[PDB]
C-alpha cells in the first residue's frame, strides 16, 4: 500500500485559551488552542486582531504563559500529548514574523502509569520552575533537563502553585481510601526534594474537583465541588453552598482581575457564573451571568468581554453588562466563531447537480447540535442549528431531503410524563408522529422509574435540502435507541425508502435482547410506516448491498431480500466470533469489524446464496472507524489518534495463511476519526476518502503507486532538515505510531500537509532540496531531479482538496 | 466381597481382577460405543445400532 493523507480543514474545536503580553510587554494578546493549531490574536477595542496561526508537530495539551527573570515579555510553555515540551518567544524582524524555540526537550520516561486526572502543567508565579504531573506517584520538575520527586499521594485531583510563600509551594487535592482531603508541599531545588507545606486540612467534600490559588493580597486556595465551595489560608477557613451549582458541576474558570477579587465559573451545560469576593476577606458570593455554549476554556479579556472556548459548539465573544437582560442574563453574544466539531456523521451531495459535491455533517451535541453545510469554491460554511443531538445522516435525492437520527434530553417531572429542557427541532416540527408497536408493547416487566433525573429519547427528523426547515419528526419508542440509517431502493420496487435500525436498552440488562428494523417512505410531507421486523438484539449497522440490505444484529450479520409483498425475507446468514459493529461493502465483498480492531472479511458467493470466510486478523486495540480503500486494501482508525491499513495478503505461499492479513500501513494522525465516506469536493492519485473528527478536522486520503510513494519519501526526509520545526520536534517522532506504551515508525502514508508546505519555502530552499535526487517521470528516463518537475507535480497533487 | 481391585482413576472397587480391567478400559475412550463382537467403535450410539444389525447376520 502507498497512501497520501493531507489536512483539508484545520481543527475548529477549542481546547485551550490564555491571554498575556506576548508580542510585546505593552501589547495584549489572545492565544487560542485548536488541537495541532495555535492562534495568536491581539485584543482591540472593537474585538480581536488576528495575527498568526501555526501548526505543531504535537497535540497541544498544556499551554501557559509566564514572564521570566529579566526578560522582555511573556514567554510561552507548551507540552504535546507525546510529551514533547517547547518554549517560544515572539520575534519580529521587520516584516518577517517568527516564533523562535528558546529551549526544547522531551520529558518522557519509559516506565510510568499515566494518572487518571491526565496531564497537568503549571508554572510558579516567580517564573522560577515548571511543575508537571504525568504519572501517579511522580512529579517532574523543570527549573531542558528535569528530575522526578516521589509522591505518596497516588490519586491527585488538582494541584496549583501557591502565592506568597518563602519557597515555591504546591497545594493539591487527593483521594485516599478514607475520603478526600487537601494538602500542601514545598519545593527545594537545592535539595531536589520536598519540604513541609505551610498548612493542611484533613477533610474536604467527596466531590471536590477544582483548585484555584488566589493571588498574593489574598493568598490561599479556592476549593470547589458539587455542593461546597471552600477557601483555606492556613488557619483561615471559609465555606459557601450556593444552590445554582447543584444542577451542573463546575469545570472551567479564569481569573478576572489581577488583584484576584473576581473569578469566572462555567458549568457542564453552558451556564456561566461569576465568583465575587466581598473583602481580610469577609465572605464569598456567587451570581449567575447567563447561558453560553458549553465551555472548555474561559478567559477574561477586557471591557466586560469574555472569550468562550468551546469543544462541543461554536466559540463566542460575549459582553458582561452591569445590568441583567430581560431574560435574566447579564451576558449577550457579540460574535460567534465557526466550530465543525464534534463530527459524528457526514454525507456528500452535489446539490446544484454540477458535479461538485458539498459536505454536510451532523455536528455538535446538546443545544449546540447542528448541521454544517460545507461549500468549496476555498471552503464556505453555512450553519443550521438544531438544538438537539444529531447522530447519523443519509441523503435521498428523489425526496430532496435528509434523514437524521436525533436525540434530546428530558427530565422526569412530577406529573407522570417528562418535560424537555428547551425548545428543539423535534418539538418544532410541521408534522409529528409516534410509532406504536404491539410487538414491543408485549414487553411486560418491572421498570422502577425515578422521577427527577435525565433520560434520552430518540427522534427521526426529515428536513428539506434547500430551506433546512423541520419538515417532519417521528418519535421513537421508549427505551429505544436510534442506531443505523440508510436510504436506497430495494428489489423490483422503484420507490426509495428510509430504513432505520433500532434497539431496546434497559438499565439493568447489558446485552440487548431486542431491536427493530423499520422501513419508511416519505410522501407528500408525511412519513408512512412501511414494515416492522423484530430481531433479538441491537441493529448496529445497515448498508446497501446490490439491491439487498445488509444488516448487523449484535454479533450476527444477516442479509435481507425485498419481497414482492413489500417485506423483508431472510435469505442467508453468517455468524461471527466477534461483535459485528462496523460494516462496509464494495461490490460483493463484505468487511466486518468490531470495536477492538478484530477484522473479519467476507465475500458473498451468489452461486450458493451464503458467505465464505476469506480472511481474518485480530490485534487487540480500540478501533473507532474503518473503511475500504479497494479490493485488497482497507483503512482503519485505532485509538492513539492513529490510522492503519491492512493488506489482503498478496500471494502468500501458505494456503491456510492466505486468509491472514499483514500490516502495511500505520500512521499517527493526531485526531480521533468517527466516520469515513467516499467522495471529493472538486470536479497520479487513485481513490478518495474524506473523514471527520471530534475536533472537526477534515482530511482526504487517496492511493498512490509505489513510484509515487518512493519519490515522496526521500522528499520528506529532505524537507525535515530544512523546515523550521516548532519546538524542533522531528516529524518522524510526531507521526510515529504511538500507544500509551509503544512506539513504531509510520509507513505507507505521506503527510500531505508537509508536502504542500514545500511551495511556501523560499526558492533557494527548493533547489537545495531537489539536488542529488534520482528522478523518474514514469515509464521512461531515469535522471537527476529537476527543481521544477516536483513543483508542477506538487500543484496537480494539491488539486485534490 | 471385600473388593480388593481398585481403579487408580476413579476408585471403583471390584471383587475380581478381570472385572477391574473391563473398567479401566472404559476410562480411556476412543468413541466408546464399542461393539463386543468385532471391536469396531462408533462415534454415536445410533450409528452403532445400524452397525450392530450387520453383526448379528
Amino acid at each position: 500500500s502507498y497512501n497520501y493523507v493531507v489536512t483539508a480543514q484545520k481543527p475548529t474545536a477549542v481546547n485551550g485559551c490564555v491571554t498575556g503580553h506576548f508580542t510585546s510587554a505593552e501589547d495584549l494578546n489572545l492565544l487560542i488552542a485548536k488541537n495541532t493549531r495555535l492562534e495568536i490574536y491581539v485584543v482591540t477595542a472593537e474585538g480581536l486582531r488576528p495575527v498568526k496561526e501555526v501548526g505543531m508537530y504535537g497535540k497541544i495539551a498544556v499551554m501557559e504563559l509566564f514572564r521570566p527573570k529579566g526578560e522582555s515579555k511573556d514567554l510561552l510553555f507548551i507540552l504535546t500529548a507525546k510529551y514533547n515540551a517547547c518554549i517560544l518567544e515572539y520575534k519580529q524582524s521587520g516584516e518577517s514574523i517568527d516564533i523562535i524555540t528558546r529551549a526544547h526537550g522531551n520529558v518522557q520516561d519509559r516506565i510510568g502509569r499515566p494518572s487518571e486526572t491526565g496531564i497537568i502543567g503549571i508554572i510558579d508565579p516567580e517564573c522560577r520552575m515548571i511543575g508537571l504531573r504525568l504519572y501517579d506517584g511522580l512529579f517532574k520538575v523543570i527549573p531542558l533537563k528535569a528530575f522526578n520527586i516521589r509522591l505518596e499521594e497516588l490519586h491527585v485531583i488538582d494541584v496549583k502553585f501557591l502565592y506568597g510563600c518563602q519557597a515555591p509551594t504546591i497545594c493539591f487535592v487527593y483521594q485516599d481510601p478514607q475520603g478526600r482531603h487537601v494538602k500542601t508541599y514545598e519545593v527545594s531545588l537545592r535539595e531536589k526534594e520536598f519540604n513541609k507545606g505551610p498548612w493542611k486540612q484533613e477533610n474536604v467534600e467527596a466531590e471536590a474537583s477544582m483548585v484555584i490559588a488566589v493571588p498574593e493580597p489574598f493568598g490561599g486556595a479556592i476549593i470547589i465541588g458539587q455542593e461546597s465551595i471552600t477557601y483555606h489560608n492556613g488557619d483561615k477557613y471559609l465555606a459557601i453552598a450556593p444552590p445554582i451549582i447543584k444542577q451542573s458541576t463546575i469545570v472551567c474558570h479564569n481569573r478576572v482581575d489581577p488583584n484576584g477579587s473576581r473569578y469566572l465559573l462555567g458549568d457542564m451545560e453552558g451556564r456561566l457564573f461569576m465568583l465575587l469576593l466581598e473583602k481580610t476577606l469577609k465572605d464569598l458570593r456567587v451570581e449567575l451571568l447567563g447561558e453560553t455554549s458549553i465551555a472548555e476554556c474561559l478567559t477574561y479579556l477586557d471591557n466586560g468581554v469574555v472569550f468562550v472556548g468551546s469543544r462541543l459548539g461554536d466559540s463566542q465573544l460575549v459582553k458582561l453588562n452591569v445590568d441583567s437582560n430581560e431574560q435574566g442574563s447579564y451576558v449577550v453574544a457579540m460574535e460567534t466563531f465557526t466550530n465543525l466539531g464534534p463530527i459524528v456523521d457526514m454525507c456528500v451531495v452535489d446539490l446544484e447537480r454540477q458535479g461538485q459535491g458539498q459536505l454536510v455533517t451532523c455536528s455538535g451535541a446538546f443545544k449546540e447540535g447542528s448541521l454544517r453545510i460545507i461549500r468549496n469554491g476555498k471552503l464556505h460554511i453555512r450553519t443550521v442549528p438544531l438544538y438537539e443531538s444529531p447522530r447519523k445522516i443519509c441523503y435521498q435525492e428523489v425526496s430532496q431531503c435528509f434523514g437524521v437520527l436525533s436525540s434530546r434530553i428530558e427530565v422526569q417531572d412530577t406529573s407522570g410524563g417528562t418535560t424537555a429542557l428547551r425548545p428543539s427541532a423535534s418539538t418544532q416540527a410541521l408534522s409529528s408522529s409516534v410509532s406504536s408497536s404491539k410487538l414491543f408493547s408485549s414487553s411486560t416487566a418491572p421498570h422502577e422509574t425515578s422521577f427527577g433525573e435525565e433520560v434520552e429519547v430518540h427522534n427521526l427528523l426529515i428536513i428539506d435540502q434547500h430551506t433546512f426547515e423541520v419538515l417532519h419528526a417521528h418519535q421513537f419508542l421508549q427505551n429505544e435507541y436510534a442506531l443505523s440509517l440508510v436510504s436506497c431502493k430495494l428489489g423490483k420496487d422503484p420507490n426509495t425508502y428510509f430504513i432505520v435500525g433500532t434497539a431496546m436498552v434497559y438499565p439493568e440488562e447489558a446485552e440487548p435482547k431486542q431491536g427493530r428494523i423499520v422501513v419508511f417512505q416519505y410522501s407528500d410531507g408525511k412519513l408512512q410506516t412501511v414494515a416492522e421486523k423484530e430481531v433479538k438484539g441491537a441493529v448496529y449497522s445497515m448498508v446497501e448491498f446490490n439491491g439487498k440490505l445488509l444488516a448487523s444484529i449484535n454479533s450476527t450479520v444477516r442479509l435481507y431480500e425485498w419481497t414482492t409483498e413489500k417485506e423483508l425475507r431472510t435469505e442467508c446468514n453468517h455468524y461471527n466470533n466477534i461483535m459485528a459493529l462496523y460494516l462496509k461493502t464494495k461490490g460483493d465483498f463484505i468487511l466486518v469489524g468490531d470495536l477492538m480492531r478484530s477484522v473479519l472479511l467476507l465475500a458473498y458467493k451468489p452461486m450458493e446464496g451464503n458467505f465464505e470466510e476469506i480472511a481474518r486478523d485480530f490485534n487487540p486495540n480500540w478501533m473507532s472507524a474503518v473503511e475500504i480503500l479497494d479490493d485488497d486494501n482497507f483503512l482503519g482508525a485505532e485509538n492513539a489518534f492513529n490510522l492503519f491499513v491492512c493488506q489482503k495478503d498478496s500471494a502468500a505461499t501458505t494456503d491456510e495463511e492466505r486468509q491472514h492479513l499483514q500490516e502495511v500501513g500505520l500512521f499517527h494522525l493526531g485526531e480521533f476519526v468517527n466516520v469515513f465516506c467516499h467522495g471529493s469536493l472538486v470536479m497520479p492519485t487513485q481513490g478518495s476518502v474524506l473523514f471527520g473528527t471530534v475536533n472537526g478536522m477534515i482530511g482526504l486520503v487517496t492511493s498512490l503507486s509505489e513510484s509515487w510513494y518512493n519519490l515522496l519519501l526521500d522528499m520528506q526526509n529532505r524537507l525535515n532538515k530544512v523546515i523550521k520545526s516548532v519546538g524542533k520536534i522531528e516529524h518522524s517522532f510526531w507521526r510515529s505510531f504511538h500507544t500509551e506504551r509503544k512506539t513504531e515508525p509510520a509507513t505507507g502514508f505521506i503527510d500531505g500537509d508537509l508536502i504542500e508546505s514545500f511551495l511556501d519555502i523560499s526558492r533557494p530552499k527548493m533547489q537545495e532540496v531537489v539536488a542529488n535526487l534520482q528522478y523518474d517521470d514514469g515509464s521512461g528516463m531515469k535522471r537527476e531531479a529537476t527543481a521544477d518537475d516536483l513543483i508542477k507535480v506538487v500543484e496537480e497533487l494539491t488539486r485534490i482538496h | 466381597s471385600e473388593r480388593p481391585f481398585h481403579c487408580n482413576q476413579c476408585g471403583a472397587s471390584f471383587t475380581q481382577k478381570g472385572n477391574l480391567l473391563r473398567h479401566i478400559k472404559l476410562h480411556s475412550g476412543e468413541k466408546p460405543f464399542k461393539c463386543p463382537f468385532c471391536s469396531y467403535a462408533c462415534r454415536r450410539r445410533d450409528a452403532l445400532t445400524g452397525h450392530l444389525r450387520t453383526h448379528s447376520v
Binding site: E116 | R3, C10, L26
Partner: protein
C-alpha cells in the same frame, strides 16, 4: 524472574504433564520417573521453569501453544519406605510453539517465542475532555451489599465516566460492554450465586490477574481453555468468559454428548478453595474436580469408600455415564448426620462441558452460537 517478550527461548518439555495451564494457576505434580526428577533435579538449580503444553489431539500430539510454568515448591522424602516426590508449580507467561527437540531420553526442549501481554488503556483517553479529567475520579465505591444489589448507583457511574462518549458514533452503554469495571461487576454478581467467599479481598483489582482467576474456576473444555489463551486482550477474555457464563450452563458428557449431567445452578463452593479445584489421588492422577449439589443420568460403580477422600466426612462412589459408561466423577455421601449438604455430588471437568442448551422448544429451537 520472567523472560522478556517475544524472546527466542529454549525450554524443557515435561512428559505426562497432560493439561492446559492458565497463568498463576498452581499445579501439584506427582513424580515417579527418575527422568522427571532428572529434569527437576537439575531444573531446580535454578530456573524452576518448564513449559506446560496445550494438546488439542494428544493421541496424535497436536499442540500449538501453551503456558510456561514456574516450579515454586519442591521437597519430598521416602516416608514409610515409599520414595515420594511431589512439586507445586505455577504458570507464568504464555508461549507459542516454534521448533521442538525430543532429545536422547525424552528431554523434549522447546524453541519458543514469548507471548506478549497486551495492556490497553480505557476507551476515553482519546475523547475525554481535558476540562473533565478532574471529574474522571468518582467519590469512590460504597463496598456494600445494598446499593450494589440495587443498580441505581451503577447507572450514575455508567452515566458519568462515559459522559464524553456522546462525542462518538456509539453511546455509553455500549462501552459498558467493554468497561473492565463493569464486566468485573457482571462477574461480581454471578459467583455469589456459586460461592460465599468474600469477593472484595480475595479477588485482584487488576483485570489481568482477575481474568486468569475466572479462567481457573470455570469447568470448560480443554479446547475452550486453549483459545482462551490466544486472547491477549483481558477485555476480550472477559466477554468470552461472560458469554460462556450466559450460554454455556448445563453440562453433558464430553464423550457421548447425549446426556445432560447437571446445570450451572447446581454448582456450589464447599470450601473457600472454590467450586472447582485440582485434587490428587494416591497414584499421581490429578483431577480438576467440580462440586455440584445435584447430578443425574449416572450409574454408580462399587461400594462407597472413605479412602483418601478429598472431603473428610464423605464417602465417594464412582459415577459413570448412563449411555457410554465413561467416567464422569464420584457421588460423595456423608458419613454422619450433622454434615451440611449430606450428598454433595462432584464431577471431574475433563469429561464435562456446560454446553449450549439446544432448547427443545418447538418455537425456540436453535438460535445463534457466537462464541464471544
Amino acid at each position: 524472574t520472567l523472560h522478556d517478550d517475544d524472546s527466542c527461548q529454549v525450554i524443557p518439555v515435561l512428559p505426562q504433564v497432560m493439561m492446559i495451564l492458565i497463568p498463576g494457576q498452581t499445579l501439584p505434580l506427582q513424580l515417579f520417573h527418575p527422568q522427571e526428577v532428572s529434569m527437576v533435579r537439575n531444573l531446580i538449580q535454578k530456573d524452576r521453569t518448564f513449559a506446560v503444553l496445550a494438546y488439542s489431539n494428544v493421541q496424535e500430539r497436536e499442540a500449538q501453544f501453551g503456558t510456561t510454568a514456574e516450579i515454586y515448591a519442591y521437597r519430598e522424602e521416602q516416608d514409610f519406605g515409599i520414595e515420594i516426590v511431589k512439586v507445586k508449580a505455577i504458570g507464568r507467561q504464555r508461549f507459542k510453539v516454534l521448533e521442538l527437540r525430543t532429545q536422547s531420553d525424552g528431554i523434549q526442549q522447546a524453541k519458543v517465542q514469548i507471548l506478549p501481554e497486551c495492556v490497553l488503556p480505557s476507551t476515553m483517553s482519546a475523547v475525554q475532555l481535558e476540562s473533565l479529567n478532574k471529574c474522571q475520579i468518582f467519590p469512590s465505591k460504597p463496598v456494600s451489599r445494598e446499593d450494589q444489589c440495587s443498580y441505581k448507583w451503577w447507572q450514575k457511574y455508567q452515566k458519568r465516566k462515559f459522559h464524553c462518549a456522546n462525542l462518538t458514533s456509539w453511546p455509553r452503554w455500549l462501552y459498558s460492554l467493554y468497561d473492565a469495571e463493569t464486566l468485573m461487576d457482571r462477574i461480581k454478581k454471578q459467583l455469589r450465586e456459586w460461592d460465599e467467599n468474600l469477593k472484595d479481598d480475595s479477588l485482584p483489582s487488576n483485570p489481568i490477574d482477575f481474568s486468569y482467576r475466572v479462567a481457573a474456576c470455570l469447568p470448560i473444555d480443554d479446547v475452550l481453555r486453549i483459545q482462551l489463551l490466544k486472547i491477549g486482550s483481558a477485555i476480550q477474555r472477559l466477554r468470552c468468559e461472560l458469554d460462556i457464563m450466559n450460554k454455556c450452563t448445563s453440562l453433558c458428557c464430553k464423550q457421548c454428548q447425549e446426556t445432560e449431567i447437571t446445570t450451572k445452578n447446581e454448582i456450589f463452593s464447599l470450601s473457600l478453595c472454590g467450586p472447582m479445584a485440582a485434587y490428587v489421588n494416591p497414584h499421581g492422577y490429578v483431577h480438576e474436580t467440580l462440586t455440584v449439589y445435584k447430578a443425574c443420568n449416572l450409574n454408580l460403580i462399587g461400594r462407597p469408600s472413605t479412602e483418601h477422600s478429598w472431603f473428610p466426612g464423605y464417602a465417594w462412589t464412582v459415577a459413570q455415564c448412563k449411555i457410554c459408561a465413561s467416567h464422569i466423577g464420584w457421588k460423595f455421601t456423608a458419613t454422619k448426620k450433622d454434615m451440611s449438604p449430606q450428598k454433595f455430588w462432584g464431577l471431574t471437568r475433563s469429561a464435562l462441558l456446560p454446553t449450549i442448551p439446544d432448547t427443545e422448544d418447538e418455537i425456540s429451537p436453535d438460535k445463534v452460537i457466537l462464541c464471544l
